[PDB]
Design a protein around this ligand. Structure first.
Ligand code: AN2
Ligand code: AN2
Ligand code: AN2
Ligand code: AN2
Ligand code: MG
Ligand code: MG
Ligand code: MG
Ligand code: MG
Lengths: 183, 186, 182, 182
């Protein structure tokens, strides 16, 4: 049931916050992203935290080829992530690479917030970023990531230790994937 | 009257803010400063003496408390008691209750404070929901003489659910029950 | 008025560009008055000067002028080693409000220099909005934990970054209702 | 049986009291079997020895016997510099479960020795209750973050305290359902 996947992964996300586990994960590396993905989809996907080995094609979207995935992710790891502009760059490339069979979008948005929090003492205020504008920026980010960088730059918050802001980002993050959730 | 309902509901709101903003773990563990950090935030817009040591003598209800003349220095002595072991930790809790450094709010603020010591030093907190009001207040009074009862009642009701927000709420509910206030939700 | 505004801003840039800032005493009222003297030198007759009349109006409860010089020495004696100590001193220093004008902007440069030396960070003021800041400052009279949370969440290690210093200037002035460019 | 349990405990204290423990290789299967060999000396014919049958206990998912020696070299090759790396190695070692019996107890002494050398801590196992430990070990096959949190929260720098070493023995044996004394 989808309702398992939703209710349980949301519970796991709250546990990451309440147990202070988010800050234990490596910053801005594929390792840190799979630590998030692994805990998120713990008893849900058998590939939790695991790189895919088949190719996936959504549509008009070229992702990293399965044959070169592990090496490509190492290249992404070594991109810099000190400035905002670098951080969205790395996010844009990790999304293009799409290392997981499923759960890339939700897990990467948690991962992005942690880079911003550690490096710029901000997180994304996803609640003010509507679904249509966000998904469009993400699609266009395969050519030009200017629109995405602006949309995110216009919606930062300094409430980086605020559990209710974290909840609000979970709500909107799942909305981006067509799941309407509560608390 | 109604300003009592303000006291209660706003202090409970402040307690949930300490969790939800991750302020609890920012406060100093097991010292009077840490206790007064909790008291001050709990009673922020409620008590004009929030976080402040009293300057007149309680010594109320037939019980002997620290005299105001020597209060600040006595609190320093309590600060240097060790709190590594369960036995030490309850000793510190007992001696600080005896000192009773605030005009009001000692009971609720010290139980949050006890939990933080236990969390940091033993990865547990008190499961106050299973410690009844009668047994707790009796052990507290008796701890003036002998704190064996208090140590036992607490040891028998520890929980490792130290990152569980709902357990935290259950401990707010019971802590205010001990002081004669029936609150809900939070 | 907008001349005097702009001239204090130009003095703030001279303090960075001439490397005068690292000359000043750290975390004392003398250091603060050094900043306040240079900031407002041909703007306020009292630049760098302790005030001799009580502040303005309202239900504002800043230090009494007659005891100001002595209370400032007690403020000077507070420690400024930890983050918690540094904000404690900032909070008490703002309560005493030692100048006739220029307390907010001068004290913010001052607090940045304390944090820079003691902890190799400054406040990235551009990320702290005016409403939350002034609320935290007013509430620090009753309890300063929120102020400490607001500032700590907003620290930056870009302590030699000239553009951070500029952005801090512009926001610092907005806190006081001053629109400033470049 | 109760003689065997008690004999292995006697062996564990000999390892401490004779300072044999620090003789053993750190963080390798070789070091582990050194522990397991001395531990179960007159107790298991296979003491210190890789098993040759699969542990077809239930639907437990350990390393197949046929590939056990090679996968053990792969485990050996994992790093054990950081806490995160060290639990990762413990998790993969427990998954391979290289002994017919005695995996849990021998591996806990072995893990304490890694942590002691690399981080100057050991696990204060007495504060880790049995229910939470076994769930974390079982779940570490899917995600080992909870296990890492449990263990990290219970590190102690009392690395030469023989009374801590004794309490870890008592708790380690309870994890396997043996009620031992002193
Ligand atoms: N067509 C597309 N081109 C580029 N990026 C795309 C895309 N369709 C989706 N995405 C990105 O991938 C994410 C969803 O990937 P998916 O693996 O399903 O994650 P999920 N829905 O399981 O959380 C979106 O949030 C978006 O960032
Ligand atoms: N007679 C007494 N002797 C010793 N301790 C006593 C006592 N009466 C109450 N206490 C303790 O002090 C706490 C009350 O704190 P207090 O400042 O007087 O009340 P409150 N409701 O403002 O929190 C109780 O929770 C109890 O633990
Ligand atoms: N009511 C108040 N209580 C305490 N502090 C207050 C306050 N209103 C303002 N403040 C603080 O004082 C500063 C204003 O000081 P002021 O003397 O006007 O300096 P200025 N505007 O010339 O830079 C503000 O930045 C704020 O931090
Ligand atoms: N189902 C399981 N999956 C993974 N690990 C498991 C498990 N059941 C038990 N374990 C682990 O293996 C240990 C038991 O191994 P065993 O070979 O029986 O050792 P022992 N010392 O009891 O004689 C436990 O302490 C636990 O860490
Ligand atoms: Mg999916
Ligand atoms: Mg009351
Ligand atoms: Mg002016
Ligand atoms: Mg045996």
């Amino acid at each position: 049931e989808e309702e398992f996947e939703i209710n349980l992964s949301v519970k796991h996300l709250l546990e990451l916050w309440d147990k202070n586990l988010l800050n234990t994960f490596e910053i801005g590396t594929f390792k840190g992203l799979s630590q998030i993905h692994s805990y998120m989809f713990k008893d849900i996907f058998d590939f939790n935290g695991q790189i895919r080995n088949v190719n996936i094609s959504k549509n008009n979207s070229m992702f990293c080829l399965a044959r070169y995935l592990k090496q490509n992710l190492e290249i992404i790891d070594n991109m810099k992530h000190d400035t905002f502009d670098q951080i969205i760059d790395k996010y844009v490339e990790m999304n293009i690479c799409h290392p997981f069979r499923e759960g890339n979008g939700r897990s990467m948005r948690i991962w992005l917030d942690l880079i911003l929090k550690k490096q710029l003492n901000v997180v994304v205020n996803w609640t003010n970023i509507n679904k249509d504008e966000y998904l469009l920026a993400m699609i266009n980010s395969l050519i030009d990531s200017t629109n995405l960088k602006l949309l995110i730059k216009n919606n930062l918050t300094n409430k980086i230790t605020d559990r209710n802001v974290y909840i609000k980002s979970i709500i909107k993050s799942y909305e981006y994937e067509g799941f309407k959730i509560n608390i």
